[PDB]
Design a protein around this ligand. Structure first.
Ligand SMILES: Nc1ncnc2c1ncn2[C@@H]1O[C@H](COP(=O)(O)OP(=O)(O)O)[C@@H](O)[C@H]1O
Ligand SMILES: [Ca+2]
Ligand SMILES: [Ca+2]
Ligand SMILES: [Mg+2]
Ligand SMILES: [Mg+2]
Ligand SMILES: [Zn+2]
Length: 493
């Protein structure tokens, strides 16, 4: 009943909320739970949002941040999230900045002005639990009624100084024990809880037989056939496996780079920037901690070249594929020889007891159960592991384009022009990204670029009807994008 009122478009804030949604974000339709969480936030409620990767958590706090006077402070332990969101917001001409760790002094000075201007201020938990200058800046905003909200983006002491400021916590963790632990911490606030299925609608799950001395050649062949020009990740069990996987792909002309703790800080920074920008690196061959630290929205494939340690690890590692919502593939190469490799690592782990080993073995038991279960829908298997009941077993049958492997068991001239145009528009976004200091997908994302190419239009009134196209973006990037589209005028209709 409280949640049905959160579906209303008749609040005092609705007109401004919808104006900013359409004109500043360039959007047209809300996704599951977005309108409800946004309305609860603008009504002053504390919120807890449980939403999988790709669901659209960012808009849940960024759109209320734009509507409200003053500053929304966003706490996040993920540096990749902070950099991505500040680039995204800056590209949209939404004032935003971060404090993670002289440049801080300029931010504190701007926040103290009559008009702080900054709408979203991103900070790390370490920065907000140590910087006394940040605390007094927040005190100054609070006294002028310009401290709008505290957000924790990926929620996996401060309420005493600012008790009237609402809190919004968001998480993509499917672990129900972690979800309940976060809710326990927020319980005194009596937050509105918005939950939904953790099913990743756009991911295709596969489990393939692994040849222990030939998996690199199978990766190379699959990538050339399905995603020759798209980014991907190959997760490996060890640093040496990363290096041999990258070596093998490099010897065959595929731009692959190993990404792990063995690299120097200089080499890590170079591999990260080449892969994020599609600049001389198509695939990163990574250990789990390293692959989970980079936030690219258009990862078209995640391949697990060896067995993951747990289903929770598998879901969260494969799950970062396709944050843009476009179809992506999640291939797990399975051999029981990798179970033995993992058991040896478990037995040799330093400071390990029968309990830590038992925990690791129990995690391995469930991962192998998924690999050996060749009948039940893989979407159902993943959600059953996390205790999510009520998932439609017919999902893969209803959407065969994203069917898991267990449920599985012509080009026109105008479309050729659409593909050529899309290629030129992506190249334009890469050159614009260098000029504006953002990654190409923060000039225009995958879906916006795909729809711009499909239109083949150079009319701003048509282009402004596409999701993600905004008047502020056409003022900054429009001459370049429209110059490309103009060349396709014979094919528009
Ligand atoms: N209502 C919407 N309509 C269209 N695109 C949207 C909408 N909400 C979010 N998006 C886009 O979907 C993508 C994924 O959103 P994001 O906030 O990164 O998801 P999450 O943080 O939940 O993984 C982004 O490119 C974002 O701009
Ligand atoms: Ca958004
Ligand atoms: Ca289920
Ligand atoms: Mg996010
Ligand atoms: Mg409350
Ligand atoms: Zn299925």
């Amino acid at each position: 009943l409280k949640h049905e009122r959160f579906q209303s478009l008749s609040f005092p804030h609705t007109k401004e909320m919808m104006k900013i949604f359409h004109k500043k974000f360039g959007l047209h339709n809300f996704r599951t739970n977005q309108l409800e969480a946004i309305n609860a936030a603008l009504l002053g409620e504390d919120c807890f949002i449980l939403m999988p990767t790709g669901g659209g958590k960012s808009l849940c706090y960024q759109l209320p941040a734009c509507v409200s006077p003053g500053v929304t402070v966003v706490i996040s332990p993920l540096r990749s999230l902070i950099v991505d969101q500040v680039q995204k917001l800056t590209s949209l001409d939404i004032p935003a900045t971060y404090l993670t760790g002289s440049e801080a002094t300029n931010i504190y000075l701007q926040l103290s002005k009559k008009d702080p201007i900054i709408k979203l201020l991103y900070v790390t938990p370490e920065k907000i639990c140590a910087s006394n200058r940040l605390i007094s800046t927040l005190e100054n905003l609070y006294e002028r009624k310009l401290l709008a909200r505290f957000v924790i983006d990926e929620a996996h002491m401060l309420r005493q100084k600012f008790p009237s400021v609402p809190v919004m916590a968001l998480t993509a963790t499917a672990n129900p024990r972690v979800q309940k632990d976060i809710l326990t911490q927020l319980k005194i606030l009596r937050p509105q809880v918005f939950s939904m299925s953790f099913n990743r609608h756009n991911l295709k799950y596969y489990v393939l037989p692994k040849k222990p001395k030939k998996v690199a050649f199978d990766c190379l062949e699959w990538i050339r056939k399905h995603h020759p020009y798209d980014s991907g990740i190959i997760y490996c069990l060890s640093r040496r496996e990363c290096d041999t996987m990258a070596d093998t792909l490099q010897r065959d002309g595929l731009a692959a780079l190993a990404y792990h703790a063995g690299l120097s800080d200089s080499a890590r920074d170079e591999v990260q920037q080449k892969w994020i920008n599609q600049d001389g690196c198509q695939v990163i061959c990574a250990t789990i901690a390293f692959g989970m630290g980079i936030d690219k929205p258009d990862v078209r494939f995640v391949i697990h070249a060896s067995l993951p340690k747990s289903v929770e690890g598998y879901y969260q590692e494969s799950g970062r594929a396709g944050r843009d919502g476009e179809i992506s593939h999640c291939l797990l190469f399975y051999t029981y020889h990798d179970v033995t490799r993992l058991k040896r690592l478990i037995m040799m782990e330093k400071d390990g007891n029968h309990h830590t080993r038992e925990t690791h073995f129990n995690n391995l038991y469930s991962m192998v159960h998924y690999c050996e279960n060749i009948t039940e829908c893989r979407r159902i298997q993943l959600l059953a592991y996390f205790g999510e009941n009520g998932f439609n077993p017919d999902f893969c049958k209803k959407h065969p384009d994203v069917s898991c492997d267990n449920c599985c068991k012509k080009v026109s001239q105008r479309e050729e022009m659409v593909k050529k145009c899309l290629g030129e528009l992506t190249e334009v976004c890469k050159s614009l990204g260098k000029v504006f200091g953002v990654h190409y997908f923060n000039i225009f994302n995958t879906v916006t670029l795909k729809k711009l190419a499909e239109s083949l239009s150079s009319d701003p009134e048509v282009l402004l009807q596409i999701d993600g196209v905004t008047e502020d973006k056409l003022e900054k990037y429009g001459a370049e994008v429209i110059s490309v589209l103009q060349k396709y005028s014979e094919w528009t209709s």
